[PDB]
Amino acid sequence: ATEAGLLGKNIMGTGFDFELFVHTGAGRYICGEETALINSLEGRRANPRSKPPFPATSGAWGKPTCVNNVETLCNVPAILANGVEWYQNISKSKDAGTKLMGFSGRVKNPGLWELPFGTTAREILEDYAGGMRDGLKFKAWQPGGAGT
C-alpha cells in the first residue's frame, strides 16, 4: 500500500500524511486492555491506567489516541463505501452491523462465520456448527470468550 500511493506522504493528493507501523507484542494477556496496550506501546510494563483521563484525550505519549479492535476497523470501509443507511439496513436489531460469530469446542464443525446480529445461538450451534459430536451431549455454553 505504501508503494502504490496509499500510505506515506500526500495520500491520493488530498494532503494527508499517515505512517503505519506494526508493533509485535511480547505475549501478555493484559496487553489487550486499551490503557495497558498504550503502556506496552510506550515500552513500559503493561499495567492499565486510571480512567478518567480516558485515552481519547491523553493516551499514547500524552497525545490524543484512539484504540480500536480489528473488526471495527474492518467494518468501517464497508460503511464508507456502501453508505450509512445500507449499514443500518442489514438486520432489524438495535445493534447494527454483522458480527463474526461461531461455536468452538467439541462441536461437529467448529469455525468462523459472519452473521448479522439477532441470530439465535442455537442457529450457530445447529445450522453452522452442526451440534455436538458423536456420542456427546450438550451441558453449557459461554458466549464471549473465557471472560463470560
Binding site: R45, R49, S50, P53, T57, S58, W61, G62
Partner: protein
C-alpha cells in the same frame, strides 16, 4: 466543597481527593499505596468507601477514596458494612502470603500493615494453603532487605523513581511473583535511599544500622532535634536506648523536611556511640593522665586562666549559638575567633550579606518545590545540601504538573501528571567542576573551573539587564548557551538561584547575587539560596569574629598564652603542622569537645562536651531559620561516673569561676536571653522554641512513649535501687512518659508521632492541620531576618579566564555525601560506604604526566608528600587536579589552592 460522612456535614477543600480530605478531619480510613507527597495510584484498593450521589440512596458504589475527588455534594460512608467487609477482605488477601515474621521484624510496633490489620478488625485466618517466598538482595550497608513481607503497594518504586530520581530500584516479576529491588546485588546509590525505611509500610526496607543494635519503638527515648551533618537543618527525631543513640527518624517540618531526610543525616549518627569519645574531664601533667569531675576541673581551669595575660577562644561552625556565645563572653568580644579560615569566612559573610541585605526573598525548602526555572552556580548540591537537590527535582517536575493541571486533571492524579508531561520539564542549569548527580534532569550542565562559572553567571546577569557589569571574551558557542539560559530564566515566573560557599570561590557568589538582582529588576518573584558548609555556619557568621589565621598568629607571636578550642579539630581549616606548632608553642590549650580530636595531645585540659543527642541549643540553618535542638538523654543515668555536660554550660561555669570564684551551672533560658540581649541580630532565637516553663495544661512533654518498658530493670545490674529520673531544667521536655504527646496539643515541637491505632510513620497525619500540609499549630523554628526594603548594587569585580599555569595545579573540590562531613565520616557505618580517596585528572594531563588510572601520584602541600591513586575525569577541565574534600588529610580549605610537585610516586 461540602461532603457528608455518615450524615455529618464537613467543609473540605474541593481540590483534594477524599482520602486525605477525611484524614484531615480525623476520620480513619485504612490505606497502603497512597502517600501525601507521592500521590494516588489506586493500587492497594484498601481505601474503599461507599459513595452516594443523592441524600436518599440505598445501594451506592464502593469507590476509592484516594481516587475520588472531594467535590461539593458527595455522601460517602466509611463504617458501612459492605465497605468494612471489603476492607477486611483486602487486608485478608494481603495477609494470605505474609510470613510469620512479626517478632523477628525490625518494624514490629512501627508497622503500617499491623495498624491496618487491627484497624479493620481482622484476626481470624481461614487461608490454609502455602505462602509464596522470595530471595533477598544485599542493598548495601544501610538498607536491610526482606521481600517476603511485601504487599506490592508500589510505594518504593514510586518514591525512588518518580520522586527521588533514582534508577536502580524497580518493579519486576509477574502476577503474584512481584519483586521490588535491583537487577542484581549491590549498594543503592541514590542519596535519598534512607527514606525507604519509612516509605515502605512493611518491613521490607529496614534500617540496618538500627538493626545492628535493635530496640522496639516503645523502648526508644525520643527527642526533637536538628540534623547537624550539613547546613540545611532538617528536623530529626533521635531515639536512644541503654545510653547510646539508636536511630535517627524523620521529624515532620511542613516548611523544611516534611517527609524525607537524606542518607548522610539518617545513617551518619554513628560518631555519637564511639567509645573513644571523652566522657570525663581529663587533665595532663606531662605524661600523666588523670580524671576529674566537674568542680575541680573548673577551679583548676579558672586558676590557669587567671594566671595568663590574654585568653583567646576558637569557636566552630559545628557548635551551637549558645556555646559560641558563651566562649565569646568568656574570652571577650575582641578575642573571639571563628574556627573557619579567612576564605571560608569571607564567602560566609558574602552569603549572609546577600541573604539579609540583598533584597531578594530566600525561600524555605518547602517553597523551593514551586519555583519554575533553577540556576545552580558553583554549588554541588546533591553531595552537600541533598534535600535542596530533591526539592529542585520537584520544582523541575512542576512543569508536567502545570500541563496536567491545565487539562483539568486533579493534583493527586500523579499517574496522569507523568502521563501528560512525558519528558517536558522545567529548565535546570547546573554548573560544577565535573558532572553532578543532577545531570539526568538538568537542562544544561557547565563543567568548568570556578572562574569560568563565575564569568558565566556574570554573562547571564549582563544579558538580562544591561546595567550589570559585562564580561568580554566569551566564545560564540558559550554565548549561545548564555542566550539560551537567559531566554529560559527571563520567561519564567519564579526563578531560583542556588549558590553556596562550597564552590570554593567568592566570584561565584557575586555572580549569583548579580543574576538574582537582574531577575529582580525585570519584575519577577526571584529567590536565592546559599548552601553553607556546617550546620551552624550561618549563626557563626551572624555573630562574627576573626579567622583561624589570626588566632594562629596570635598564638605564634606569643600574645595569646591560653587558648580555648570549642568543638574544633583545627586541621579542617588550617594546615596540621602550623596548628601543631601554634598549639605546642602556647602554654595552655583547653579543648572543649565531645570527640577525640587530633589536637587533644597538645591539649593541657580536655573538657568532655555533649553532642546533639546530649545537649540543648540553637542552630541557624542556611536560610536564616533559628531552630532549637533538644536533649535526648542524660549520659549519667547509666554510667554514673560520666561527667559530660553541655558546652555552653562548661564555658559559662568557667566564666563564673574565673570572675567570682564560684561554680554556677546555668540554664539554657539564661544563655538564650544573654544572646538576645547582647546581640540584636540574634534576637529571633528566643522565639525558636518556648522556655522550660511551657506546659500543656500544667504538664511537660514526654520524651518517651506511654508504653516505655523496663523502668525497674534496665539499671538493675548496677543497683537494684532505681534512682530519681533526670530532671530537665533547660527545656520543657522531661526524661519520662509523664508528659503530653497528644496530636491535638497546642505545641509545635513534636518528639515522635504516635496516635491510638497509628504506630507507623503515617501517624504524622494526626499532627497536622491538613494531611501533607503544615504542622498543626505552626511549624517550629522562626526566621532570624526578613527581606530588606532595598538590595545590593552590582558586583563589578568580574574574574579572569582560567589559564592553566605549568607546574601549579589548581585543586578542584569533589564533595561526597559520605565523607565530607567532619562527624559523619567518624561513623563506622560510613567507612564501608565512602569511596576510596582518588585524585581526579584530565585524560590530557594524565597522558602528559604518563600516569594511568590505578597508579599512585604523590603531591606535596606544606611538607606533606601524600600519595593518592588516580581516577580519570573527562569532565574536569585541564590544569586542575580533582581532590575529595573532608577526607583524611585533605581539608575543605584546600579548595582553590595550588599544588606543586605532582609527580608519579
Amino acid at each position: 466543597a461540602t461532603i457528608h460522612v455518615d450524615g455529618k456535614e464537613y467543609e473540605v477543600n474541593g481540590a483534594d481527593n477524599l482520602l486525605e480530605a477525611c484524614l484531615s478531619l480525623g476520620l480513619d480510613i485504612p490505606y497502603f499505596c497512597w502517600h501525601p507527597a507521592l500521590g494516588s495510584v489506586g493500587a492497594c484498593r484498601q481505601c474503599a468507601v461507599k459513595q452516594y450521589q443523592n441524600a436518599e440512596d440505598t445501594r451506592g458504589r464502593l469507590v476509592m477514596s484516594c481516587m475520588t475527588p472531594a467535590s461539593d455534594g458527595t455522601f460517602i460512608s466509611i463504617d458501612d458494612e459492605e465497605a468494612k467487609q471489603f476492607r477486611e477482605s483486602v487486608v485478608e488477601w494481603l495477609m494470605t502470603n505474609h510470613p510469620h515474621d512479626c517478632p523477628v521484624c525490625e518494624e514490629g510496633g512501627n508497622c503500617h500493615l499491623q495498624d491496618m490489620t487491627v484497624m479493620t478488625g481482622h484476626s481470624f485466618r481461614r487461608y490454609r494453603f502455602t505462602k509464596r517466598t522470595h530471595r533477598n538482595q544485599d542493598l548495601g550497608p544501610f538498607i536491610s532487605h526482606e521481600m517476603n513481607r511485601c504487599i506490592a503497594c508500589y510505594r518504593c518504586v514510586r518514591y525512588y523513581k518518580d520522586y527521588a530520581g533514582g534508577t536502580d530500584l524497580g518493579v519486576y516479576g509477574a502476577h503474584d511473583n512481584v519483586y521490588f529491588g535491583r537487577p542484581e546485588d549491590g549498594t543503592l546509590e541514590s542519596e535519598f535511599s534512607g527514606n525507604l525505611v519509612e516509605i515502605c509500610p512493611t518491613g521490607v526496607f529496614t534500617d540496618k544500622t538500627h538493626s545492628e543494635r535493635y530496640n522496639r519503638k516503645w523502648d526508644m527515648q525520643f527527642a526533637p532535634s536538628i540534623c547537624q551533618q550539613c547546613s540545611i537543618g532538617c528536623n530529626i527525631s533521635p531515639g536512644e536506648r541503654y545510653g547510646e543513640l539508636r536511630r535517627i527518624e524523620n521529624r515532620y517540618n511542613g516548611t523544611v523536611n516534611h517527609y524525607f531526610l537524606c542518607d548522610r543525616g539518617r545513617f551518619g549518627y554513628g560518631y555519637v556511640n564511639l567509645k573513644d569519645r571523652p566522657r570525663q574531664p581529663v587533665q595532663r601533667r606531662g605524661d600523666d593522665f588523670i580524671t576529674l569531675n566537674a568542680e575541680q576541673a573548673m577551679q583548676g581551669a579558672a586558676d590557669i586562666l587567671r594566671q595568663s595575660k590574654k585568653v583567646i577562644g576558637i569557636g566552630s561552625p559545628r557548635a551551637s549559638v549558645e556555646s559560641n556565645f558563651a566562649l565569646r563572653e568568656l574570652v571577650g568580644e575582641e578575642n573571639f575567633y571563628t574556627g573557619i579560615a579567612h576564605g571560608e569566612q569571607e564567602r560566609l559573610q558574602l552569603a549572609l550579606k546577600v541573604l539579609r541585605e540583598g533584597g531578594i526573598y530566600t525561600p524555605a525548602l518547602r517553597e523551593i518545590e514551586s519555583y519554575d526555572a533553577v540556576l545552580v552556580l558553583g554549588e554541588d548540591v546533591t553531595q552537600t545540601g541533598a534535600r535542596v537537590a530533591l526539592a529542585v527535582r520537584q520544582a523541575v517536575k512542576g512543569k508536567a504538573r502545570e500541563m496536567a493541571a491545565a487539562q483539568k486533571v486533579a493534583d493527586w492524579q500523579i499517574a496522569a501528571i507523568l502521563n501528560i508531561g512525558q519528558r517536558a520539564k522545567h529548565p535546570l542549569f547546573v554548573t560544577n567542576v565535573d558532572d553532578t548527580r543532577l545531570d539526568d534532569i538538568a537542562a544544561w550542565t557547565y563543567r568548568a573551573p570556578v572562574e569560568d562559572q563565575a564569568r558565566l553567571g556574570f554573562a547571564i546577569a549582563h544579558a538580562l539587564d544591561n546595567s550589570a557589569p559585562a564580561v568580554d571574551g566569551i566564545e560564540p558557542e558559550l554565548q549561545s548557551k548564555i542566550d539560551v539560559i537567559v531566554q529560559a530564566l527571563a520567561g519564567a515566573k519564579k526563578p531560583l538561584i542556588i549558590s553556596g560557599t562550597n564552590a570554593g570561590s567568592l566570584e561565584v557568589i557575586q555572580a549569583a547575587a548579580n543574576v538574582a538582582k537582574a531577575l529582580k529588576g525585570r519584575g519577577a518573584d526571584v529567590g536565592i539560596t546559599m548552601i553553607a558548609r556546617s550546620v551552624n555556619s550561618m549563626g557563626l557568621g551572624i555573630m562574627g569574629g576573626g579567622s583561624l589565621e589570626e588566632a594562629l598568629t596570635e598564638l605564634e607571636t606569643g600574645r595569646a598564652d591560653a587558648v580555648v578550642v570549642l568543638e574544633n579539630d583545627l586541621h579542617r581549616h588550617a594546615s596540621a603542622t602550623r596548628v601543631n606548632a601554634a598549639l605546642a608553642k602556647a602554654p595552655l590549650v583547653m579543648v572543649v569537645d565531645h570527640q577525640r580530636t587530633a589536637i587533644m595531645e597538645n591539649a593541657h585540659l580536655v573538657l568532655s562536651a555533649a553532642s546533639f543527642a546530649e545537649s540543648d541549643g540553637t542552630v541557624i540553618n542556611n536560610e536564616g531559620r533559628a531552630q532549637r535542638f533538644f536533649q535526648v538523654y542524660d549520659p549519667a543515668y547509666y554510667d554514673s561516673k560520666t561527667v559530660m555536660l553541655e558546652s555552653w554550660r562548661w564555658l559559662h561555669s568557667l566564666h563564673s569561676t574565673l570572675l567570682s570564684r564560684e561554680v554556677d551551672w546555668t540554664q539554657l533560658d539564661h544563655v538564650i536571653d544573654a544572646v538576645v540581649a547582647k546581640i540584636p541580630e540574634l534576637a529571633g532565637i528566643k522565639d525558636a522554641a518556648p522556655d522550660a516553663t511551657f506546659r500543656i495544661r500544667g504538664q511537660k512533654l514526654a520524651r518517651e512513649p506511654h508504653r516505655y518498658s523496663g523502668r525497674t530493670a534496665m539499671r538493675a545490674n548496677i543497683s537494684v535501687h532505681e534512682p530519681r529520673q533526670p530532671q530537665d531544667i533547660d527545656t520543657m521536655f522531661t526524661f519520662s512518659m509523664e508528659g503530653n504527646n497528644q496530636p491535638t496539643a497546642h505545641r509545635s515541637q513534636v518528639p515522635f508521632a504516635w496516635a491510638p491505632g497509628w504506630n507507623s510513620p503515617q501517624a504524622w497525619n494526626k499532627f497536622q492541620d491538613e494531611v501533607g500540609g503544615k504542622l498543626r499549630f505552626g511549624d517550629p523554628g522562626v526566621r532570624l531576618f526578613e527581606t530588606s526594603e532595598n538590595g545590593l548594587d552590582y558586583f563589578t569585580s568580574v574574574p579572569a579566564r582560567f589559564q592553566p599555569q605549568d607546574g601549579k595545579w589548581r585543586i578542584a573540590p569533589y564533595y561526597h555525601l559520605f565523607g565530607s562531613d567532619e562527624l559523619s565520616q567518624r561513623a563506622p557505618v560510613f567507612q564501608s560506604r565512602m569511596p576510596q580517596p582518588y585524585i581526579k585528572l584530565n585524560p590530557a594531563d594524565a597522558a602528559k604526566l604518563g600516569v594511568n588510572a590505578g597508579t599512585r601520584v604523590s603531591f606535596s602541600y606544606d611538607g606533606n608528600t601524600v600519595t593518592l591513586p588516580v581516577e580519570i575525569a573527562e569532565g574536569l577541565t585541564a590544569g586542575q587536579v580533582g581532590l575529595p574534600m573532608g577526607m583524611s588529610g585533605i581539608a575543605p580549605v584546600l579548595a582553590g589552592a595550588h599544588l606543586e610537585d605532582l609527580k608519579e610516586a
